[PDB]
Ligand binder design. Structure first.
Ligand SMILES: CCCCCCCC/C=C/CCCCCCCC(=O)OC[C@H](O)CO
Ligand SMILES: CCCCCCCC/C=C\CCCCCCCC(=O)OC[C@H](O)CO
Ligand SMILES: CCCCCCCC/C=C\CCCCCCCC(=O)OC[C@H](O)CO
Ligand SMILES: CCCCCCCC/C=C\CCCCCCCC(=O)OC[C@H](O)CO
Ligand SMILES: *C\C=C(C)/C=C/C=C(C)/C=C/C1=C(C)CCCC1(C)C
Length: 230
């Protein structure tokens, strides 16, 4: 392929595909209703990402957006992926702590605003307005991070020890990895253009695989996903 970033899109496609297959074989035979919920949510995440990394590799999920004079290559398929996978990841954390319906709706709604305004900012043609949408999307993300710390952590500390310890590890992983996304976007091709697209694609690939495959490896190997039975 003539695009220098193709090597990272192909590695991303392969790793998401291998991750999906591993979780699929692993979830076979699980009869506990609670564990089936976590396996279903956690296997769909890499399956969706696989299809959208493939679409970028083949060129379907790419568009040209004029801003700053030149034509800029914008991979819109990322936002179709994140629209469906980031809510599912939040659902994994909320069900682990047995969150209430009201708090779950708050997280999913703010997540939808995060991704939706990020997409609008990505396709905006007036350069200075791109950063207005970036700001609003980052405000929605800070609300999500606030709820995970000053809401879920308080309840996790009144549950089973395995639930509290597993949640604390996954909460920490989420806060660090998610926080990197607005930074890469800001200095990358969608924003200031300080980092070239080939390096930007490499960074997102490392973050995406860690946040979906690595996240799932820690969750599905813990005993917190199974109900307390004899
Ligand atoms: C799990 C085990 C795997 C661990 C893997 C962790 C690696 C993460 C990669 C990071 C960024 C790489 C940045 C490389 C930047 C190269 C850009 C460059 O030097 O270009 C020069 C330019 O032409 C003139 O300034
Ligand atoms: C090279 C391989 C490429 C990557 C693979 C192609 C992915 C796209 C195809 C299919 C969906 C397959 C099923 C995905 C849904 C899994 C949900 C699940 O397994 O849930 C378990 C639960 O316990 C049950 O009751
Ligand atoms: C818990 C529920 C799980 C639900 C899981 C649902 C997964 C469907 C996701 C993705 C493939 C992306 C489809 C993107 C559609 C693009 C359509 C299109 O045509 O692009 C616009 C324009 O027309 C182009 O030229
Ligand atoms: C908790 C998560 C926080 C997420 C939100 C954190 C936002 C702060 C980021 C960036 C401003 C960086 C500088 C912007 C000005 C760009 C002009 C410029 O000087 O280029 C960059 C320079 O070469 C090299 O720093
Ligand atoms: C599939 C993996 C994860 C962790 C995806 C995370 C995506 C975000 C946290 C997106 C953040 C954005 C914000 C807050 C502002 C700029 C636009 C983005 C959509 C990249």
């Amino acid at each position: 392929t003539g695009r220098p970033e193709w090597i990272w899109l192909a590695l991303g496609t392969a790793l998401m595909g291998l991750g999906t297959l591993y979780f699929l074989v692993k979830g076979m035979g699980v009869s506990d209703p609670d564990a089936k919920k976590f396996y279903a949510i956690t296997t769909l995440v890499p399956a969706i990402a696989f299809t959208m990394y493939l679409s970028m590799l083949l060129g379907y999920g790419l568009t040209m957006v004029p801003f700053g004079g030149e034509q800029n290559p914008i991979y819109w398929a990322r936002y179709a992926d994140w629209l469906f996978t980031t809510p599912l990841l939040l659902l994994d954390l909320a069900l682990l702590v047995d969150a209430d319906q009201g708090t779950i709706l708050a997280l999913v709604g703010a997540d939808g605003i995060m991704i939706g305004t990020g997409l609008v900012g990505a396709l905006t043609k007036v350069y200075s307005y791109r950063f207005v949408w970036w700001a609003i999307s980052t405000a929605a993300m800070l609300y999500i991070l606030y709820v995970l710390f000053f809401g879920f952590t308080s309840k996790a500390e009144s549950m089973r020890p395995e639930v509290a310890s597993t949640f604390k590890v996954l909460r920490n992983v989420t806060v660090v990895l998610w926080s990197a996304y607005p930074v890469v976007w800001l200095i990358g091709s969608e924003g200031a253009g300080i980092v070239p697209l080939n390096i930007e694609t490499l960074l997102f690939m490392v973050l995406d695989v860690s946040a979906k495959v690595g996240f799932g490896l820690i969750l599905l190997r813990s005993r917190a996903i199974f109900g307390e039975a004899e």
